[PDB]
Amino acid sequence: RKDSSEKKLITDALNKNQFLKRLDPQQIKDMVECMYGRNYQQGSYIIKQGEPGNHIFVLAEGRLEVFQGEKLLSSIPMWTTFGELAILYNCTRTASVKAITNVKTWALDREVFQNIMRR
């Protein structure tokens, strides 16, 4: 699915996330190899506040904004991990994440994220 170049970009994105610094390099490597590409059209939501957390994402291309309601929280820089809170802490999505342009993410599903933690 990915060359060494993309694997390195995703790896760095995951390693920079404060809540993921706990994981071993083997766990990160496993996440990377398992991640799958998903595109989103402009104006669609990658994440909706209040939903369960079924995926963790890395922004690979395009622009994303984080919202509570109509209120803007943050612009997600390229190669940033997001959607991790609801996964790690068994909570609901804390905010919505909207596609400001057409977007590509790398995504990992929740159960896999935990199978990897079960290795």
Binding site for ligand CMP (CB under 6 A): 47, 53, 66, 73-74, 82-86, 93-95, 97
Question: By CB under 5 A, which span of 8-16, 29-37, 39-47, 56-64 interacts with Co ion?
Answer: 56-64
Size of the site for Co ion (CB under 5 A): 1
Instruction: Select the binding partner of residue 105 from Co ion, Ca ion, ligand CMP, none (C-beta < 5 to 8 A, by kind).
Output: none
Q: Please name which of 105, 98, 88, 90 lies closest in space to residue 49, comparing C-alpha atoms.
A: 98
User: Contact 77/108 with Cβ under 8 angstroms?
Assistant: no
Which residues are 29's β-sheet partners? none
Least distance between ligand CMP and beta carbon 86 (Å):
3
- The CA distances from residue 101 to 26, 39, 40, 47, in Å, are 33, 11, 9, 15
Binding residues for 3',5'-cyclic AMP: 83-86, 93-94
Binding residues: 83-86, 93-94
